[PDB]
Amino acid sequence: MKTVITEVIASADSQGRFLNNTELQAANGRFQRATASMEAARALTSNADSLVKGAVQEVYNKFPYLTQPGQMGYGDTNQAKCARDISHYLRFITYSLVAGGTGPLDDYIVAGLREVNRTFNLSPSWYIEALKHIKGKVGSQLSGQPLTEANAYIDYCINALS
Amino acid sequence: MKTVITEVIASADSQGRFLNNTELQAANGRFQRATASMEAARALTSNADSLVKGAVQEVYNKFPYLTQPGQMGYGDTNQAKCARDISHYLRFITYSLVAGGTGPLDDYIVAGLREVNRTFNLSPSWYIEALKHIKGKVGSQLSGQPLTEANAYIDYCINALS
Amino acid sequence: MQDAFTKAIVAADLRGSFLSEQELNQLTNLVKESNKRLDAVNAITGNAAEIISDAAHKLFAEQTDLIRPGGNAYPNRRMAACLRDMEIILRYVSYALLAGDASVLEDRCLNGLKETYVALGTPTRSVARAVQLMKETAIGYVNSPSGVTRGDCSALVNEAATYFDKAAASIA
Amino acid sequence: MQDAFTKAIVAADLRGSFLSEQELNQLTNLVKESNKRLDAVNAITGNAAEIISDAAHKLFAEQTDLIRPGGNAYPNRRMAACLRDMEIILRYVSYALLAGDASVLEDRCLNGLKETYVALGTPTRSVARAVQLMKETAIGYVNSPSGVTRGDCSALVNEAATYFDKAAASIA
Amino acid sequence: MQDAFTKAIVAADLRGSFLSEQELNQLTNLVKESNKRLDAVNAITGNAAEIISDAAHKLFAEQTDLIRPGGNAYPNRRMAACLRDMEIILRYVSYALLAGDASVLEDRCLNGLKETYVALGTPTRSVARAVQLMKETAIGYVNSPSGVTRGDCSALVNEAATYFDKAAASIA
Amino acid sequence: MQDAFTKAIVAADLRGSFLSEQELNQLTNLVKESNKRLDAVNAITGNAAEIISDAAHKLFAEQTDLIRPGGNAYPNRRMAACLRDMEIILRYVSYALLAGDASVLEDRCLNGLKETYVALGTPTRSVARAVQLMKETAIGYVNSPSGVTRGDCSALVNEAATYFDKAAASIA
Amino acid sequence: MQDAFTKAIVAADLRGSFLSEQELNQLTNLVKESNKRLDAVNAITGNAAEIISDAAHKLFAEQTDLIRPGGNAYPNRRMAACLRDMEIILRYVSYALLAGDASVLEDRCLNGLKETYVALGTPTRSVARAVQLMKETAIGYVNSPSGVTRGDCSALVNEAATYFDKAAASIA
Amino acid sequence: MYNNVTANTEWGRKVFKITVAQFPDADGLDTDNLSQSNYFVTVPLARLLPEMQLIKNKGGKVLSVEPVVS
Amino acid sequence: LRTLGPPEGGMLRPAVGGTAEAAAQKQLGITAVAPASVVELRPNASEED
Amino acid sequence: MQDAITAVINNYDVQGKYLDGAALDKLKAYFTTGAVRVRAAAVISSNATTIIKEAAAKALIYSDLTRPGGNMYTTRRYAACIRDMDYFLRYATYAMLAGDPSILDERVLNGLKETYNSLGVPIAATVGGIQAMKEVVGGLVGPDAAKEASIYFDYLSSGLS
Amino acid sequence: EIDSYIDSDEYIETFGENIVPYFRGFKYQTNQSAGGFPRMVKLWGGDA
Numbered sequence A, B: 001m002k003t004v005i006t007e008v009i010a011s012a013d014s015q016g017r018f019l020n021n022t023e024l025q026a027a028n029g030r031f032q033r034a035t036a037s038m039e040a041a042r043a044l045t046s047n048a049d050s051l052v053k054g055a056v057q058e059v060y061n062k063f064p065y066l067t068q069p070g071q072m073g074y075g076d077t078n079q080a081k082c083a084r085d086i087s088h089y090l091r092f093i094t095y096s097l098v099a100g101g102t103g104p105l106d107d108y109i110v111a112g113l114r115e116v117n118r119t120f121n122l123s124p125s126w127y128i129e130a131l132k133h134i135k136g137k138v139g140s141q142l143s144g145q146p147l148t149e150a151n152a153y154i155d156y157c158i159n160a161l162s
Numbered sequence C, D, E, F, G: 001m002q003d004a005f006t007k008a009i010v011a012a013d014l015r016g017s018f019l020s021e022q023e024l025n026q027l028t029n030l031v032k033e034s035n036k037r038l039d040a041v042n043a044i045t046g047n048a049a050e051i052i053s054d055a056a057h058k059l060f061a062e063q064t065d066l067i068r069p070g071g072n073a074y075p076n077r078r079m080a081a082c083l084r085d086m087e088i089i090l091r092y093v094s095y096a097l098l099a100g101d102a103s104v105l106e107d108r109c110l111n112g113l114k115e116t117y118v119a120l121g122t123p124t125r126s127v128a129r130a131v132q133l134m135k136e137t138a139i140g141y142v143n144s145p146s147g148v149t150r151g152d153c154s155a156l157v158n159e160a161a162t163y164f165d166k167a168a169a170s171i172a
Numbered sequence H: 001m002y003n004n005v006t007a008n009t010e011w012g013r014k015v016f017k018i019t020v021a022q023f024p025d026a027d028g029l030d031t032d033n034l035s036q037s038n039y040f041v042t043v044p045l046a047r048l049l050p051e052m053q054l055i056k057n058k059g060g061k062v063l064s065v066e067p068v069v070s
Numbered sequence I: 001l002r003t004l005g006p007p008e009g010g011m012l013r014p015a016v017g018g019t020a021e022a023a024a025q026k027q028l029g030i031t032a033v034a035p036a037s038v039v040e041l042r043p044n045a046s047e048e049d
Numbered sequence J: 001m002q003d004a005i006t007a008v009i010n011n012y013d014v015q016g017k018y019l020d021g022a023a024l025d026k027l028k029a030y031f032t033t034g035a036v037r038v039r040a041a042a043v044i045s046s047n048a049t050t051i052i053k054e055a056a057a058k059a060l061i062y063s064d065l066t067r068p069g070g071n072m073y074t075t076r077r078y079a080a081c082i083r084d085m086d087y088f089l090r091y092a093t094y095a096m097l098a099g100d101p102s103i104l105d106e107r108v109l110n111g112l113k114e115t116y117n118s119l120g121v122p123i124a125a126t127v128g129g130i131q132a133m134k135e136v137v138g139g140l141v142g143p144d145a146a147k148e149a150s151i152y153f154d155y156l157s158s159g160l161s
Numbered sequence K: 001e002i003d004s005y006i007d008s009d010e011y012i013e014t015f016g017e018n019i020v021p022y023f024r025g026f027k028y029q030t031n032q033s034a035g036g037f038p039r040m041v042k043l044w045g046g047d048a
């Protein structure tokens, strides 16, 4: 699972080599950065409930037709599975924040994304718009390096979906 | 075992792909062709007895010396194993006719042919001459596309032995 | 690899014999029904994606545990693997259906498959079910297609079913 | 591969949950002690050769049978293999120490190792001992280094020990 | 591979010398501006897809011949080939920008590239233009981002431009 | 790989000793008989094809089931495999005979061979017999060759036999 | 690969002829001098390291620019490459000397070598010199060895020289 | 399972399983990335003698052969 | 006489025509390839590996 | 060739634009350095031979280059090499006066890399001869002009490598 | 034909069973002809 720590260890191992000053300098970055990351994580964690309901709705407001009958934003089960899915994304964003890398996002959401979305007729556009909205609101929950971190990972998901 | 059906399936599988119109068109050829093939097969099947005795003799008539003492066309066992061998060839020709490809010939007679013949001091010339004779007589048992099929496979054996 | 003719040939050879008039006409009949067979294989190819998709929707409708955390079709990576396996099995079933023999299915797909899944922790009973759903829908398509000449395809629908049923049995 | 954070994340996910305030602060503490951790990993890297050498000298001091003909650290080829294994294990212990988790050690080094040695006829009890000696000296270095700020590294010395002790237990 | 420090070191070594106080402070300044540099690289990474997409839309808006039959961005594969090349070049430009040196761009991407395109019949002038458009939009993003501290990034915007301009020049 | 000298050396080393005057003269005798040994190896090489052919003719004379359909030396493909194995075994027996030690035969040829044949359905008793026939003819040639100086080769004929007998025993 | 006999054979064959009594006796003479040849090859093998070392010491004594920064035998990596090439060339010269023909030297070592060095920026004149020094010392050893029977080795010393001189000429 | 699709002949259709244990040869210390010396290969029948030849050629010990397809 | 230098130029004057290690690789552009890094599937690898 | 001023004129001519305000800033700079570029140019000229007798000494001679087997062995080739050196110095002085490197491309670099490959002329050694003349030049011309002279020597040397 | 490269000694010695094949034609390898390097330079054709 990709973190700064696992990456430097992987690179050492693959050259049959003890960790050296290059690799320990790298690790210090990840540790120095934890404070901002983890502040973003705590803010995204406690606002999760509303961030999810905000983004879910915004998917319907931007794609009005989704909420008409015969469509995929209609009925309790679609709308339920949607909230859940955005919640999955925010969850892995917090994990990536806490972990010090994109690993959790890469392993649990990115690997396989398109195949799944294509089989199930899920448009990435919705998910990008959910995330664009989450990005708008996270502008006033955080600032400075915690915001930059939150942004880094939200944007990472949006690029994964384009 | 090489048939039109196995070939197209092999080619699909190796590209991780469902059979498509290209492959089904191919299969139709094999199925459309079955009637001529199977007529050749039935004629070669019921005449087998005499086709074999005809070709066996012709090997001795073309290589007179084979039937003298100390030679490999002498005594019951050589002459018995000869009839058997030509019978094997005709048998696999009928199989190749019925199967829709050279598979039976490739797997049971061609693979290994030269090594065996070389260890046992069996000259291909005999076998070519057995087959040339069988080809002469099959000229009047069949005609049209059944003859073309019979010919295709007899000639295939002659090229395998040259 | 075997097809229905090749199978005949192997059994004949083990007797040391030219094909029996018995076996000849069994194969003449396969040629007789081959246009229907081509339509049947074409029915599956032409709806492969929907067959997998519809089987899938229904599998997870029934077994909502697979899509929870802890479940074998969670997260996206695992769902993609599961969707991929559904396709692989549907693919070898269609190959068997063109061939008139199960061997390609048994040799290239089913052989070892159960033990793979158990090693992985993949619930074989759920995989068996996904195969049963593909069967229902696939046969649906074999039976009700676009402007094919009207006739009786039940013999072929049975045979397709046994390939689906082989796979299910082999895996569960 | 896991590190101490990644481990937290995997357990959280298996609940379907954002990390508990419990788990958050456990990880905040790991960040709190991370400078000490870097010094501890650096202590091992900076003395790797001597740690292996000194462990070695002492292993063969105790077990003079290994360096006789018939012994598993004789002739030069085998001694070089034994010296190499000492380095490999010390290396994965240092990786675990940077990571705050044993998994890289267990997965890339310890998994299958005992059965390898038994197949080879390598006396596992001697290998376990060589690991115990590396531990003594490695920790020696973690505790008494060049102009590091004075403080308490016992938590980290324990954790390093458990990695040495995992390896020993796994092998003997 | 070189970065801006490594470059200094290579030039010093060719004199047989420890780094000049001249060179030392040039590098102290690079460390001084490194937070800005990280934001600049982050600006590109965070909008890579749109940078390529927007460059693309505009390239074919201008050069409608490329998307006609006979054109080098027709049919779908050629367009897909053209769309990553855009990605590949944007990628090595971002690497150069993290590094403070063009070498990774010149050595891994630009070296031989023109002669490749000519062999292929790919119109180099169109490729140069696609690079010019990526530059416009990329710098746009470097200059106007999400809640970054206000200051002057023109030095870095220039340097990014020269990497885009190197690529363009090398290819046309 | 071992030869008769190398074997001596390994046993000496396991004692920690220079070769015993016992072992020295045993090896001096091997050098004494080495011209005969070269003729013996040459006898096999010079008639390899006939040795295999004659063994073969006789194997199938005895076991006419192998060349019927259902039999393990039918069709051409299997006969070529069987002829090939006869050559492979005769080859490693000749290597052992040049070496004065069975190890190359046991390590490169006989190790696992029985279990291979059983997996394949190859009748091991028939393979053992084919080896017994190769032995008869091979030794025939070792004993009655072209203008070799007259003397006693029975020691070497025995040793060759034990290599043939090792193979037979190992396989049956 | 050719040796002195093989060369004879190739020339004979191009005439369509059995070897001339001329060529036969030229080869009988090579067999006549072969013990001396073996000592000559042995002289080089037995002092390979010193031949390279001594050539080296002297090369850099003369050309102190190679070991300055900017020089082609600086830093350690390049010196090791240069020492390695000295060994490679001495090795193929010894092969040619066992063979009585330069071909292995020309085909496996000298062919393309000059153009390699020029591509690399390796000063060929310095490499030629290193080869001249190896020659001096190698021949030294061929002429003054440990308890070899006294006689005249000048023919072989010449021939060895031409192999050293071929290499030098080919490279400079 | 195995490698999957094989050659189209019947003599390519049969795949077998070999569990080995490769030994360190001689002559040299391996300092690269080493693997635990057990492993298993699945090889089709048409290939098998080159593969077993290079397995026993490099000081290996063939521990088990298994009929997995046939 | 042949091994004559500058006015003593002592020992840390650079060589004329300096080269700076990994420039012959940079001249041919084989920097990422000479030497190529070794990529290998470790047992029990993750997805990113 | 082009200089600072004609670089701007031709860039606007192809757009058919009268010179606009930002462009005029650029011309103001060139007239500000015009005094120092001229004083500096003179100094180099009369001290040229002295200057060239220091760059060779610190980067070329007392070496394998001047010994048998070396490219500046023989009075012929030694003469050709310091002849070249004079070209570089002289043209760099033109480029620096013009405030534009275009002349270094048109009349010096074009084809020169391959010309040197074809004769065997050592490129790396020639670059050191360029960067040694720069070192000397930067001392002689002083704070005013050091950076400006230096860049066209650096242009020359990355033009060969 | 494809199996002849992968079952060769040069593959089994170097790349083994888990190592992805990598470029070796630019350094020295044992039992090489010295034309093997400039041929590899002709085969190389740049990083892109």
Ligand SMILES: CCC1=C(C)/C(=C/C2=NC(=C\c3[nH]c(/C=C4\NC(=O)[C@H](C)[C@H]4CC)c(C)c3CCC(=O)O)/C(CCC(=O)O)=C2C)NC1=O
Residues within 6 Å of the ligand: A056, A059, A066, A072, A073, A074, A077, A078, A079, A081, A082, A083, A085, A086, A088, A089, A108, A109, A116, A120, A122, A126, A127, A130, C057, C060, C067, C073, C074, C075, C076, C079
């Ligand atoms: C671990 C990470 C992870 C992700 C991200 C994930 C996505 C995901 N979304 C799914 C379905 C779904 N996703 C949605 C999404 C939406 N519906 C709406 O109202 C909106 C338009 C939209 C939200 C923006 C819908 C409606 C379904 C049901 C699709 C179906 O079965 O027909 C499914 C199919 C299985 C199932 O039915 O639950 C997966 C795997 N699964 C995962 O395991």
Ligand SMILES: CCC1=C(C)/C(=C/C2=NC(=C\c3[nH]c(/C=C4\NC(=O)[C@H](C)[C@H]4CC)c(C)c3CCC(=O)O)/C(CCC(=O)O)=C2C)NC1=O
Residues within 6 Å of the ligand: B056, B059, B066, B072, B073, B074, B077, B078, B079, B081, B082, B083, B085, B086, B088, B089, B108, B109, B116, B120, B122, B126, B127, B130, F057, F060, F067, F073, F074, F075, F076, F079
């Ligand atoms: C499945 C397909 C297949 C083929 C084609 C086949 C050929 C074949 N022919 C053989 C022998 C033979 N083949 C012949 C052939 C002839 N003798 C004559 O009178 C004629 C000249 C000639 C017929 C044209 C003879 C004489 C032998 C005995 C050779 C011996 O053992 O000395 C043998 C050796 C085993 C045995 O003695 O039966 C094989 C394998 N075997 C097979 O399994």
Ligand SMILES: CCC1=C(C)/C(=C/C2=NC(=C\c3[nH]c(/C=C4\NC(=O)[C@H](C)[C@H]4CC)c(C)c3CCC(=O)O)/C(CCC(=O)O)=C2C)NC1=O
Residues within 6 Å of the ligand: B021, B024, B025, B028, C032, C033, C035, C036, C037, C038, C039, C040, C042, C142, C143, C144, C145, C148, C149, C150, C151, C152, C153, C156
């Ligand atoms: C490109 C490969 C290829 C295909 C696909 C093919 C199909 C094909 N299907 C046919 C007939 C047919 N196909 C069917 C199939 C069906 N009847 C039903 O009611 C079921 C829904 C379905 C069951 C599978 C039937 C009943 C006939 C008419 C009877 C027959 O010809 O056997 C015919 C004979 C002409 C005709 O009557 O239309 C062809 C050529 N030929 C080809 O070369």
Ligand SMILES: CCC1=C(C)/C(=C/C2=NC(=C\c3[nH]c(/C=C4\NC(=O)[C@H](C)[C@H]4CC)c(C)c3CCC(=O)O)/C(CCC(=O)O)=C2C)NC1=O
Residues within 6 Å of the ligand: D066, D071, D072, D073, D078, D079, D081, D082, D083, D085, D086, D088, D089, D108, D109, D113, D116, D120, D122, D123, D126, D127, D130, H023, H024, H030, H033, H034, H035, H036, H037
């Ligand atoms: C994943 C990281 C990794 C480990 C840990 C590893 C262990 C390992 N140790 C080995 C051998 C060995 N290991 C030793 C070690 C010892 N001998 C003694 O007497 C001492 C008790 C001990 C040293 C403390 C020796 C002597 C051999 C050679 C055995 C032989 O060939 O006879 C081998 C066989 C291959 C080889 O010799 O290179 C493996 C795979 N390989 C790996 O890739």
Ligand SMILES: CCC1=C(C)/C(=C/C2=NC(=C\c3[nH]c(/C=C4\NC(=O)[C@H](C)[C@H]4CC)c(C)c3CCC(=O)O)/C(CCC(=O)O)=C2C)NC1=O
Residues within 6 Å of the ligand: A021, A024, A025, A028, D032, D033, D035, D036, D037, D038, D039, D040, D042, D142, D143, D144, D145, D148, D149, D150, D151, D152, D153, D156
């Ligand atoms: C290049 C990678 C890297 C390293 C290695 C690193 C080390 C490092 N160790 C530190 C502190 C320290 N390090 C130790 C370590 C020890 N104390 C002892 O008495 C033991 C002998 C030893 C046990 C391991 C202690 C006690 C402190 C002070 C307390 C603290 O900052 O946590 C500090 C804080 C500044 C200071 O107080 O000196 C740094 C930056 N930082 C880095 O970026």
Ligand SMILES: CCC1=C(C)/C(=C/C2=NC(=C\c3[nH]c(/C=C4\NC(=O)[C@H](C)[C@H]4CC)c(C)c3CCC(=O)O)/C(CCC(=O)O)=C2C)NC1=O
Residues within 6 Å of the ligand: A033, A144, A145, A148, E032, E033, E035, E036, E037, E038, E039, E040, E042, E142, E143, E144, E145, E148, E149, E150, E151, E152, E153, E156
């Ligand atoms: C995760 C990797 C990483 C990043 C990305 C990072 C960014 C980062 N950017 C910073 C500042 C800044 N960043 C910028 C950047 C800009 N100003 C503008 O007006 C432009 C739109 C933009 C041009 C690129 C400026 C002006 C500052 C404040 C001055 C400075 O600290 O240099 C700071 C200092 C704290 C602060 O003032 O906010 C950090 C830590 N640190 C990191 O560890």
Ligand SMILES: CCC1=C(C)/C(=C/C2=NC(=C\c3[nH]c(/C=C4\NC(=O)[C@H](C)[C@H]4CC)c(C)c3CCC(=O)O)/C(CCC(=O)O)=C2C)NC1=O
Residues within 6 Å of the ligand: F066, F071, F072, F073, F078, F079, F081, F082, F083, F085, F086, F088, F089, F108, F109, F113, F116, F120, F122, F123, F126, F127, F130, H045, H046, H047, H048, H049, H050, H052, H053, H056
């Ligand atoms: C290390 C040296 C070495 C040996 C010894 C070896 C044996 C060996 N024999 C084989 C097959 C075979 N071996 C035979 C041999 C016989 N059939 C009979 O009926 C007779 C009793 C017997 C001849 C005397 C046959 C018929 C096969 C093919 C089995 C089949 O594919 O059905 C195979 C399977 C691979 C292949 O068919 O090429 C191996 C590995 N391989 C090796 O690399």
Ligand SMILES: CCC1=C(C)/C(=C/C2=NC(=C\c3[nH]c(/C=C4\NC(=O)[C@H](C)[C@H]4CC)c(C)c3CCC(=O)O)/C(CCC(=O)O)=C2C)NC1=O
Residues within 6 Å of the ligand: F032, F033, F035, F036, F037, F038, F039, F040, F042, F142, F143, F144, F145, F148, F149, F150, F151, F152, F153, F156
């Ligand atoms: C090219 C490799 C090579 C070979 C083959 C070789 C053979 C060789 N065999 C020899 C003797 C001999 N070889 C034999 C062999 C035999 N005597 C019998 O009656 C048996 C039929 C046969 C049993 C194997 C005997 C008895 C002698 C004479 C006694 C002796 O020299 O040991 C001699 C001594 C000279 C002589 O007496 O003729 C040589 C050189 N030398 C070589 O360099």
Ligand SMILES: CCC1=C(C)/C(=C/C2=NC(=C\c3[nH]c(/C=C4\NC(=O)[C@H](C)[C@H]4CC)c(C)c3CCC(=O)O)/C(CCC(=O)O)=C2C)NC1=O
Residues within 6 Å of the ligand: G066, G071, G072, G073, G078, G079, G081, G082, G083, G085, G086, G088, G089, G108, G109, G113, G116, G120, G122, G123, G126, G127, G130, I022, I024, I025, K026, K027, K028, K029, K032, K033, K034, K037
């Ligand atoms: C076929 C047998 C064979 C030969 C002969 C061979 C030559 C050879 N020498 C090389 C490098 C080299 N060769 C030298 C040699 C020297 N440097 C000096 O200054 C001295 C004049 C000279 C030593 C006497 C150096 C320094 C390099 C490294 C060049 C570099 O990478 O910058 C290289 C490039 C690959 C590498 O560095 O490993 C080859 C292929 N390679 C082969 O496979």
Ligand SMILES: CCC1=C(C)/C(=C/C2=NC(=C\c3[nH]c(/C=C4\NC(=O)[C@H](C)[C@H]4CC)c(C)c3CCC(=O)O)/C(CCC(=O)O)=C2C)NC1=O
Residues within 6 Å of the ligand: G032, G033, G035, G036, G037, G038, G039, G040, G042, G142, G143, G144, G145, G148, G149, G150, G151, G152, G153, G156
């Ligand atoms: C293990 C491989 C092997 C070697 C090395 C070998 C050497 C060898 N060198 C020999 C002779 C000799 N070797 C030399 C060599 C020299 N004389 C000098 O003064 C020079 C310093 C030197 C020049 C190379 C001479 C002069 C003789 C005696 C004449 C002759 O036998 O040709 C002889 C004949 C017996 C003797 O007179 O000692 C042998 C067997 N034989 C072998 O089987």
Ligand SMILES: CCC1=C(C)/C(=C/C2=NC(=C\c3[nH]c(/C=C4\NC(=O)[C@H](C)[C@H]4CC)c(C)c3CCC(=O)O)/C(CCC(=O)O)=C2C)NC1=O
Residues within 6 Å of the ligand: J061, J062, J063, J066, J072, J073, J074, J075, J078
């Ligand atoms: C084979 C063709 C050839 C010649 C002749 C040659 C000469 C030559 N003479 C040199 C120096 C020199 N040569 C002299 C010679 C003299 N001083 C006097 O006053 C006398 C008139 C004269 C002695 C008769 C002196 C004093 C130097 C040192 C000048 C300096 O270092 O500035 C140098 C520079 C030092 C070096 O790197 O070697 C060269 C290249 N080079 C060549 O390639």
Ligand SMILES: CCC1=C(C)/C(=C/C2=NC(=C\c3[nH]c(/C=C4\NC(=O)[C@H](C)[C@H]4CC)c(C)c3CCC(=O)O)/C(CCC(=O)O)=C2C)NC1=O
Residues within 6 Å of the ligand: E066, E071, E072, E073, E078, E079, E081, E082, E083, E085, E086, E088, E089, E108, E109, E113, E116, E120, E122, E123, E126, E127, E130, K047, K048
């Ligand atoms: C080192 C990093 C790297 C680069 C930069 C790279 C470039 C590159 N671009 C290629 C093709 C291509 N490149 C393009 C690009 C374009 N077509 C247009 O009309 C536009 C002007 C332009 C997009 C802006 C197209 C269309 C092809 C396919 C040409 C063909 O096959 O006909 C190919 C041939 C191989 C392939 O098609 O995959 C290479 C090697 N390859 C690399 O590995």
